[model samples]
Target: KGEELFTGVVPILVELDGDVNGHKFSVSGEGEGDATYGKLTLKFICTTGKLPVPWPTLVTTLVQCFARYPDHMKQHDFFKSAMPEGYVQERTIFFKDDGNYKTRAEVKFEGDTLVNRIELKGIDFKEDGNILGHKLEYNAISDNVYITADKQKNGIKANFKIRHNIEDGSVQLADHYQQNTPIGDGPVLLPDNHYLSTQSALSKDPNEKRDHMVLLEFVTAAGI
Candidate 1:
């Protein structure tokens, strides 16, 4: 027997809010897609800082937050869209954040062809006081972006406050989730007893720190 694949309506909303080295930041994204196609909208906001964040980080957070769920990472959904084409293997993602305000990126990835746009990597918060040594790196997929950390030993010690509204029967949860995890290399799994939380931080924990190396497998509904 194979893993069951979800081919129905997939609607999920994700919000990550916390401070990075005294600077406040928030990432909000929501989208719904089925077997054929889908659309997503992402908005990244930072008050006391600049530079945009990678979308994969946010997706990784989502994966960590809902890692225990069944259909959250199934085929033909938003998670599929987050992964690379080589990795259907999943959108049209609209991002209006810092640096690209005037540009207003509109990315459309159809089948296996992905158009590349703005690419940025590495940003550190050292102005206020580098306690956690906050660092960031951003990589683009299709037209969106993904962030990678630089040569920083310690990750940001943040009590990430999550707000989500998922319209699905496979995954069930309230309107809020909160946890304090070190955002760094490898999987940052939530507490096992934590409500509805599951799995490591990333879908696949990497051995060597590479740029945008998030690979999540997909299942076919017809197979199972």
Candidate 2:
């Protein structure tokens, strides 16, 4: 017999400030436990209207929820305050090599949300510092934020793992790295080192060897 998956499920509403324009938005949906999927979704809607705000504002509001939720608050605090020594800005510089150089980076923390921005600068020795590389930026959208690397001017895109622990307010690297992948709504397992590496073979002058490097910077609301 086929039974309705969420016949008696109750929906929860989460409000957020909109970013596209100045409109408030809400994420409402209901889920039911399933034998295989664990939590099966019945319905979900992301809409704006109740209040007028932009998408960025709504994003901020939605991100703020983690801090208020007991389960999420702990993780948020851990990622923000207990960032590993190597992950810190000063320590990040040591990771740079001839193939990669970090331009600038910043990390910002607000309650349960942790945001990080890293500017990458790549160099090509054969081209006499032609700057034949791309810039990479990372944003810890929220405490459990995901890292997305885009080639921007180049044609590279990757997804990396990022996680935050609440027990001692520390941030640690997750275990996934996708190289030259497209950005989509899907999960891509990270690599062994949680970092992706790629080289350009389509340059106008194929003889020049292109190298890549990543520099990291952080910004946090708590000034950590």
Candidate 3:
């Protein structure tokens, strides 16, 4: 994003490799095939004060507030072209809320479709307010959330409020998934719970009229 020339974050991660442009990109790790066999693990980023919120959380909130935003923009159907994706994997998302919105999560992956043994990670609030000094917020972030080598910016921007008496170190969040089209808007409250969310892209186009849903396409050399 930040004045990017392309769309996704694939370039920065694995380096452009070779032939930045030869009508070529990459599939898995191969840099030579017109079309190759492989999978890609792409990473994005987020922040607060310095930047904004995490992309995942920020994007969803954008849609919801859009309607009530500078303008609430009109919305369409809940299940527009809904049939929802099949009830396949049982998704168990683990969130470790460090504080102030920063969280670390773990989700396993299989072939391509989905993952399990999901675990979320956060920080222990007991160690509050600069107690760690320059070593503040020291901990490993989630796979999706990267911790930069810059000591000044080593931690993820988790905006958690300090509640000393009650939930102790546990943080709660409510994502009104406005950004989610077919799934519609709902609250994702936490102590560790989700709002009927899916692992697919939440198509975000206010003027979008096309039906958004998961499509199953299969091929086995039949060119069907």
Best by lDDT, which number?
Answer: 1
Scored by CA lDDT, what does every candidate get?
0.26, 0.23, 0.18
Whole-model lDDT for model 1 versus the true structure?
0.26
lDDT tens per residue, model 2, 149-191: 3334111222333332222343323232222321232232221
Which runs of model 3 end up more than 4 angstroms from their true locations? 1-41, 45-49, 54-56, 59-168, 175-224
Model number with the top TM-score: 1
Candidate 3, residues 1-224, lDDT tens digits: the string is 11111112111111111111121221111111000111122322211112111223221111010011011211121111111111111111222243322221221112322211111222332243222111222121111111111123211121111111112343233221011111212321111111111121322234533321111111111100
Give candidate 1 misplaced runs (Cα > 4 Å). Answer: 1-6, 33-59, 62-137, 140-224
Worst 10 residues of 3 by lDDT: 62-71
Residue range 1-224, candidate 1, lDDT tens digits: 01112134344343445443333455443343333322222222332243234333344232211122344323312222232321111011222121111111122233332222221222342342211222222222121111112113211111222222222322111111121223223432121111222111222224533222232212121111
- TM-score, each model? 0.26, 0.19, 0.18
TM-score of 1: 0.26
lDDT of 3 at 146: 11
